[model samples]
Target: SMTVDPIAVCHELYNTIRDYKDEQGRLLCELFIRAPKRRNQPDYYEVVSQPIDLMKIQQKLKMEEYDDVNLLTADFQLLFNNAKSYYKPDSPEYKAACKLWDLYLRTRNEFVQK
Candidate 1:
C-alpha cells in the first residue's frame, strides 16, 4: 500500500475552500483568508483567543506542522468559528463564515470519501 501524505491532503483541501465561489461569483473564503487587521478590527483579538486563517493554515501545512489530517481539519473549523464568534449574526462577516463552513464540510466529506 502507498503511504498517504497528510500535508499534501491538507493543501488540496485548503485550496479547494479558498477558490470556492458563491452564487454572486465572490470568493466566499476570501473573508477569512488573512488575519483580521488589529487596526481595522480593534476588538478582534480580544474576542478570538486563537486566530486561524487560510494563510496561517497554508503556512503551517507548508512547514509540515500538522502531523495528522485531524489537526488541519480543526484549524479550518477554528478559522470559521472565530469569525462567527467575533461578528454579529446580522453582519456579512458572520454570514460568510457560515457559508464557508457548510462548503468546507461538504468538501471535506467528498475528499474523505475518495
Candidate 2:
C-alpha cells in the first residue's frame, strides 16, 4: 500500500471529536493521549479502521479536502464505537481504531486545553 501521512488523518479524527458530547469519545481520546507507548509505531497506525476509510470519513465530516483538515462530527464516534463492537480487541480493525485514536489524542491539545 502507498504510504500516507497517517498522522495527518489521525489529526482529522481528533478534530472530529473535539466538539462532540460523548464521554466515551473523550475518554477514549484521553486514553489514546495518555496511553502507554508501544515499542514501535505499528502498521495499523498507517490508516483509519476499515469501516471508516480516510477518504470517506473526511467527506462525511464535510471537512475540506486537504492534508490538515479536521473531520469533526458526532458520527465519527458512532463509527468508532461500531468498530469496537464489531472487531476483537486484538484484531487489525481494532488496532487501526486504536492507532487513529492515539494519533488524534497526540495532537488534540495543540490548539486547545486538554
Candidate 3:
C-alpha cells in the first residue's frame, strides 16, 4: 500500500495557485470557505459566478472610487512575488485553501475567459 504525503499535497497546492495574485487567492479562498454556508442558496452563487471585469476594477480603484461590492483583486504584488519564490506552505489547511483557489480559478476563468 502507498502512503499519502501531506507535504506533497501542500506543495502541489502552492504550485497550483503560484501564478495567482495573493489577494485573489485570499478572496477566492474566502468564497470557497463560505461555499458551505451558501451552498443551498442559488442567488449568491448566481451573482458571484458572473464575469467580473478586472480592468474596470483597476480603473475604479485608480480613480479612488470605493464600492463595497467591487470584485477588485488586491495589490499585494510584492507579496505574491516573494511568496512565489520562497513561501513554503506546510499546513494541511493550506492544502485545503489551495484546493479552494483552484476551484475558484476554474469557475472564474469560465466566466471571464469567455
Candidate 4:
C-alpha cells in the first residue's frame, strides 16, 4: 500500500473554493465554523469515541474552504441539497431504522440506561 499525504487534498480543496496566496507576495485563509446554537445542535455529533487531536482536526477543517460545489453535481442532479427529512441526520423514523455507526453513541446513555 502507498502512504497518502494528508494535507494534499486539504490544500487542493482550500484553493478550489477560495484562492489564497503567500503573505509577502499576496495569502492565507480566513475561514471558520460557527458553533451550534443552544438547543439547536445536530441530532448527532460528527464524531464520537475517537481520540481527540486538535492539530489534526484543524487541518481537516481546512477542507471547508471548499463548498458543496461540483462535488455532488454529476450524478445527483439536485443542486447542493441535503438527504431530506426521510433520510436526514435527525429524523426519528430514519433513526429507528438504521444502525448508522453512531447508533452506539446514541443509544449509550440516552436510550440504554439499564
Candidate 5:
C-alpha cells in the first residue's frame, strides 16, 4: 500500500547513521564502520556471538538481504548491543555506542513516520 520503497528507506537510514558527525566532526559511527580486527580485538568475536557493523549492513542492503526497515533495524540494534556488552560502561566506545543507538532510534522514528 505504501509508495515508498523499503530498500530506499533502508539506504537513507543506513547512510544517515554511517555519516553522522559529532561536535568535533568525528564520525560517531567510526568505531562501528567495519568488522573488528581479530588481532587488535582478539576477544571481540569471543564475546559477541553475532557481530554486526555498518559495512556489513551496507553489504546486506546491497545484496537485498532485508525486505523491510524492521529487518535492517535489527542489524543496527545488534551493532550497538554488541559494543555495549563488550566494552566497559564508562568507556568512550560504550558511550559512542549509546549515542549512536539513540541517534538511530530518533532517525528511524522520523523516517518511518514520514
Candidate 6:
C-alpha cells in the first residue's frame, strides 16, 4: 500500500492554479484548489460549478464583475487576483485570501448546522 502526503497534495494544488497561459498569451490567474479536495466532491474540478452574485461584488468596494461575466472564467479571477499583477498576489494578497477562507470556513459549519 502507498501513503498519502498532505504537503505534496497542497504543493500540487498550489502549482496547478498559480498561473496559466491562455489562448491570447495572457497570464490567466485561476484559483483551483482541488488536489487536497479530490477526497471529496468528484466534480470539484468544475470552475463554473459555483455561481457568483456579480451585483454583490459590485456593491463590495465597487468592484464590478466585467460587464460580460462570461468573459471571465466563472469567478476565477476574483478567486485569484483583483486586477492582475497590480495586486501582486504573492504578497499580502495571499494572506488576505487565506483570511477570507478562514472566515468562510467558520460560517460553513454554521451553514451545515442549519
What lDDT would each prediction earn against the true structure? 0.80, 0.46, 0.36, 0.29, 0.83, 0.36
- Please say which candidate is ahead in TM-score: 3 or 5: 5
Name the runs in model 6 displaced over 4 angstroms: 1-90
TM-score of each: 0.82, 0.41, 0.27, 0.21, 0.85, 0.26
Report the Cα lDDT for residue 32, model 3. 26
Runs of candidate 5 exceeding 4 Å displacement = 1-4, 37-42
| lDDT for each residue of candidate 5 in 6-105, tens digit (9 for 90 to 100) | 7877888888887889888888888888868767887887898877788888889889887788898889889989998889899878989898889888
lDDT of 6: 0.36
The local distance difference test score of model 2 is 0.46
- Compose the digit string of candidate 2's lDDT tens values, residues 1-114: 134453465554556544333434443333222211233434433333334433455464455444432333233454555556556799755665665555455544444333
lDDT for model 4: 0.29
Colliding residue pairs in candidate 5: none
- Tens digits of per-residue lDDT, candidate 3, 38-102, equal 45755534443432222433344456443321132232222122223222477433444555445
Could you give candidate 4's per-residue lDDT for residues 39-93 as a string of tens digits?
Answer: 5535422321122222333444554432332321221121011222224557532
Put down candidate 1 lDDT per residue, 8-106, tens digits, no spaces: 667777788878888999888778778887677768888988877878887887788877778987987898889888899998889888888787777
True-structure lDDT of candidate 3: 0.36
* Alpha-carbon RMSD, candidate 2: 13.1
* Full candidate order by TM-score, most accurate first: 5, 1, 2, 3, 6, 4
Clash pairs (backbone) in predicted model 3: none
Give the number of the best model, judged by lDDT.
5
RMSD of each: 2.7, 13.1, 17.8, 17.5, 2.3, 18.3
